[PDB]
Amino acid sequence: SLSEIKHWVFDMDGTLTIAVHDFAAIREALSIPAEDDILTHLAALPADESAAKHAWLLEHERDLAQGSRPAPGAVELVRELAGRGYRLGILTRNARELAHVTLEAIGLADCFAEADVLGRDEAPPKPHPGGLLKLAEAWDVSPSRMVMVGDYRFDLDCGRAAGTRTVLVNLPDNPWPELTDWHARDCAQLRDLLSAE
Amino acid sequence: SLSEIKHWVFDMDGTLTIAVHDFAAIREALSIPAEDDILTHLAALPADESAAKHAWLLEHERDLAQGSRPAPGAVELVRELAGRGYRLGILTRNARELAHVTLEAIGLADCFAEADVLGRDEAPPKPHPGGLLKLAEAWDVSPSRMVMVGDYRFDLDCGRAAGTRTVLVNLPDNPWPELTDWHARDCAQLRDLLSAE
């Protein structure tokens, strides 16, 4: 049962936080009417114009980015787990300092012990198991009793390599069934699963 | 007339080259059937699943990127202009060395004099006019007789600031009419415009 796992490890980008983008710049560049939602409008254009505009959006993802915000239900999930006294960690490609700043920004800095936030300098890149093995050792716990929560195949591969359980969030379905122990559309639904199962 | 302009300056990313992405990874992550085109499939999903999957694609643009390839008609346009004996330049945020490598990769290194490829270290970031002013001076030409070709508002703003003519490519329409002297869906159509007008 998911509620039996008391040691949780989170990816950051795409899991606890998501990139936000300049909506007004997007609307101007792609000629979206104010009364239309961006994606709904693009989906309704002729296929060739839709493809061209989507390709442009993707090409300029970084130009249009404006930092990040908490992913849906992420703050809620982490606070729920922290409230249970569970042990929480982070395994991110970000530098530890930046991860720290982000955690403070989204109001979750107090939910993770500083030593349990592993960044660029503390662990090899996913899907290398190193970071999870480090946490498992620091926590004196079997990996089979930890869960790795992520949104990308490398997060799941990392969990499988280290031997932890794995959770996919922030996709609506189950694209890697064999790599994925639990899946939820987002952290809010994951919190619901935790509560029910 | 466009054919009267004999001094042309190109942006790189999004104009002469475009990022390519890992199609197989995308298809696996978003559960796209082999017989479906990715975008057409997403456009046909329920709106909520479509939005979630598009947001994921955008969030992982850099994870899914696999270098770049020539933009449609770009090699053809540059060779056509070089063949006319026109003077050609580049104004890119990329380091000059990388711009050089890219130009070699796509077979256009011989179309630009090395001194006329301005990168990170040779010119301030768009939309600062500096890079175009530098080329105009090096070429002993009035900016009104140069054209800046780009795919982003900053390219057009840069041209307007320096006083060059401006061209938008790689969007299908005309989102910044006042900033844009000519627009074309891509470099191939731009070559056609050049030929006809």
Ligand SMILES: [Mg+2]
């Ligand atoms: Mg991630």
Ligand SMILES: [Mg+2]
């Ligand atoms: Mg560009």
